[PDB]
Amino acid sequence: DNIQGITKPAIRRLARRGGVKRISGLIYEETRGVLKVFLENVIRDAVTYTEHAKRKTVTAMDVVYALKRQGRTLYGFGG
Amino acid sequence: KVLRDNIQGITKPAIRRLARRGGVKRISGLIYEETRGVLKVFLENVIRDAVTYTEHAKRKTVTAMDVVYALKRQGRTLYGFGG
Amino acid sequence: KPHRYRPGTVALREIRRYQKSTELLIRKLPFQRLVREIAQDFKTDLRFQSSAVMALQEASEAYLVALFEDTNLCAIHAKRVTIMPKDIQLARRIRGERA
Amino acid sequence: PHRYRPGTVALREIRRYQKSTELLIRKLPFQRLVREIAQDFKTDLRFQSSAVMALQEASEAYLVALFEDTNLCAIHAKRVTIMPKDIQLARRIRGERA
Amino acid sequence: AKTRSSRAGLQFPVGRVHRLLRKGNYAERVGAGAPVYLAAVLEYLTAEILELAGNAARDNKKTRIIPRHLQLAVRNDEELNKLLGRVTIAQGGVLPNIQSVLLPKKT
Amino acid sequence: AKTRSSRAGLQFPVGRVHRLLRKGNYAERVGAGAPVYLAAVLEYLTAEILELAGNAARDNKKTRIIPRHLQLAVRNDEELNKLLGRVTIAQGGVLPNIQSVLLPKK
Amino acid sequence: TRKESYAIYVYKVLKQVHPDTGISSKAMSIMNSFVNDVFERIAGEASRLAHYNKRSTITSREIQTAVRLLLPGELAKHAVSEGTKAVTKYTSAK
Amino acid sequence: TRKESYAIYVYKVLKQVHPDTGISSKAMSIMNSFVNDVFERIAGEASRLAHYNKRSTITSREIQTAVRLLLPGELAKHAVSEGTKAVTKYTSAK
DNA sequence: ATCAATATCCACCTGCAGATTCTACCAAAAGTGTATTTGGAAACTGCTCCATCAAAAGGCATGTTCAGCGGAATTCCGCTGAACATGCCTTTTGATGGAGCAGTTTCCAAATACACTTTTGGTAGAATCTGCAGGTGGATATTGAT
DNA sequence: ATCAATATCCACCTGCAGATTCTACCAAAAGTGTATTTGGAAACTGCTCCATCAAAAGGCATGTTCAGCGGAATTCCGCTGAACATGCCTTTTGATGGAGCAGTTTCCAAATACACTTTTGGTAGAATCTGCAGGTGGATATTGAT
Ligand SMILES: [Mn+2]
Ligand SMILES: [Mn+2]
Ligand SMILES: [Mn+2]
Ligand SMILES: [Mn+2]
Ligand SMILES: [Mn+2]
Ligand SMILES: [Mn+2]
Ligand SMILES: [Mn+2]
Ligand SMILES: [Mn+2]
Ligand SMILES: [Mn+2]
Ligand SMILES: [Mn+2]
Ligand SMILES: [Mn+2]
């Protein structure tokens, strides 16, 4: 599956940038669930803005407005 | 008269009660001073904004609405006092 | 004959009682002076509607009660049943109140 | 032969990744994940390339901050190894997990 | 002359909501369908909270809903809890909840 | 006919800010000074970040400010960090920081 | 003097779901806060949504998307039906 | 076509501050997000203040209080200082 | 303490992906004088409600003794995760067309808005009506000693 | 398990603080009327988004080995809960003085909107221009064995 494309080594890299020294084996599946929940929440709102505009293309701005609503404001992609 | 040291009016027993409502069973002796400092900061931030709303409206009386708006700005919305 | 509850028994009894009621737990007048003192240090000559003081008290007690729940989860996470200043600090760091 | 002790390379990697800014999840795989999830809300969607990047930057910044909080929870328990319970405690306290 | 509310089949005030939408600077114009739809959502939400609160009132052998009942209704409902996740209900107290490891004995 | 910005002594467009305030549905009317004050405020904050980012650029021996430098200026400054407390700067990375207990026993 | 509130409407709705149940003034104050709060949140979202699409008009369509972004799943689905229903019925009349 | 942005102005300020320093497009894009973000927050607060006080005009007075509410201490002082300075400079220029 | 395998640094070099500059071009804007309309400050003032003080009384805070048991230091060891070498699958990079669908422009019918102007559904204060707070007594549930 | 010191649940009872009806004004909605105009609906263009193909190389996956972390168990000092005795200070109830807020009226500094004129800001071509990411050489530091 695609969620499994988010690899153990890549999750490690993320942890490292997070200052993490040692990782438990259950961490990788736990991290995947968290990311999926995060993407579902943000993508759901962005697509809601896409449909409202009557488009078939999810725009950077759709994503930016979605992130802002979730209180996760992002700089660098417009607006 | 002069108001000083009122943070002590937040007693050890009152802080126990609050912890009880919060589900706490055992409390270390240093918790009380820590709680007082956390509450002082909480109130300084809220009162600061409520008072800013008061001065802007050019009045000398902090209204329930000033507090409610202050609380809302801080994402601490309160129901029951006009907003 | 001098009956005695074991440590923890009365505390549990206390949690059940306070979780069942809704009254404010900090004495009123003392809380009012605190508000007046902190406000006075920002601006002198301020008056307060009484419902303003109460709004601050409900807001403050809800904030502390929920902080204690989070603090309690931090103690238990540490294999303890006693809250300590370090639990309060971990909770506030994670909540972003001083990350 | 030669062998670094457990932890030494781990430290080295933290220093390296805390010093750079490139994304750490391979792109193609991330893109499939995004499209797959979007498809459940609205079928036949297209994505501006910058839309997927915004999502990746947002996701990685999120996961990285979560890991720092997770690390703080593991250290609080006297450990140096993060576990599922550490991520859970951090999320509950953040208000994402109730 | 029928009320816009009766025309809409609603208890909540459509006109009031219309006027509130105008005076709030949300946009230069307010379509006629807006207040109707908004008044309906509001009424649905309040109907939902009152159903649960009246129930909490009944469970506590009360006839009068008080803030404690509103709090129990909201905090016990996954969705309302989330919609009001950053709100505090004055005089609502909290839900009875004690962590397991805190309980006495064994087994 | 001179620019309202030059009258205010600003680089930021007082006129645009004025129009943006009207089209934003913030209120029925906008005072004449509102856009001036706002523009000045936006320029000051803009300069405050450029200054710290510029320094971050120089400390790294680079002359071109990149997102990494904006991240370093904001996160290393207590006040800017709070103002942007819930903002993510794309391609900014994080500040080097390793919890002491993780360092090897020397 | 004079000050509006949703109290009579909240009250009408209380009687509909619980004919024999009353409400204290504090609880009514809370219900009033709740309505104003959700009003602002929805109107606020509708406002942004309109600006994002360079629309000068907020229609039932903006209120609708605003409701989908604002409410959790099931409350959303039901709010939408109630909203769509009232608009349709309002339109069939007159 | 036609995308309006604060880029040329950000670059102008970049020159008064660090005459020999440049800025990447991505970095410029971030600065633009910054200005728009701070613009929306400040304006949003001033809007609310005017409504709370039943006023129909947003004047420099609302922009000032909004600044004090949104900016951390020192940043507020200088920002309010710069705002007051710009309006004075502008109020006396025949 | 002595090598030895690697990781880390610095000075130097330079092709090009991305930045600055000339340049022109055009519409989108922004600035000024002019006429109309009004938002909101000063000036007066009716009247709510906020600060103060006095007086009684018991609900609670304070301070102390006593000892249960929680927290934390110390020791031991099973086994999970780190490091690393081997094999190789998939992500990445880049040229290519084919097309879906955003973005522009023009047309025009359904649908707002402010002023009018008539009318009643709300609101504040007075009148009317009851849920339950709080006190008492007794049957049931819980604790903790032996 | 048996028995005593206590907390706790629970239904009947009842005066009262607070809730649920009755009046009469007044902001504040709502049918019409024009005049104005948003923005949906269609024909049209071309900017990017998707599917396809293809090698180089860089990761990712797997398996082996063992260092050292996590957690179980044991121990004890001392902190913190429970219980008690003493009396302070918060709470409850009002009465008084007036500070200040909120309603009303009056009137001018200031704002919205054309209508008209000018240019600044956006874009992009195509050309111009260059900071720095890699990649090399050799020197010194870091780490870990013995
Ligand atoms: Mn019912
Ligand atoms: Mn007027
Ligand atoms: Mn123990
Ligand atoms: Mn087709
Ligand atoms: Mn009537
Ligand atoms: Mn009772
Ligand atoms: Mn009794
Ligand atoms: Mn250990
Ligand atoms: Mn005493
Ligand atoms: Mn380099
Ligand atoms: Mn070399």
mmCIF file of C-alpha atoms (C1' of nucleotides) and ligand atoms in Angstrom, chain I residues 38-40, chain J residues 106-107, ligand 2:
data_model
loop_
_atom_site.group_PDB
_atom_site.id
_atom_site.type_symbol
_atom_site.label_atom_id
_atom_site.label_comp_id
_atom_site.label_asym_id
_atom_site.label_seq_id
_atom_site.Cartn_x
_atom_site.Cartn_y
_atom_site.Cartn_z
ATOM 1 C "C1'" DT I 38 -22.911 61.461 8.100
ATOM 2 C "C1'" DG I 39 -20.171 59.250 11.741
ATOM 3 C "C1'" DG I 40 -19.066 60.441 16.113
ATOM 4 C "C1'" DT J 106 -26.239 69.369 18.550
ATOM 5 C "C1'" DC J 107 -23.118 70.147 14.630
HETATM 6 MN MN MN K 2 -25.931 61.295 12.466
#
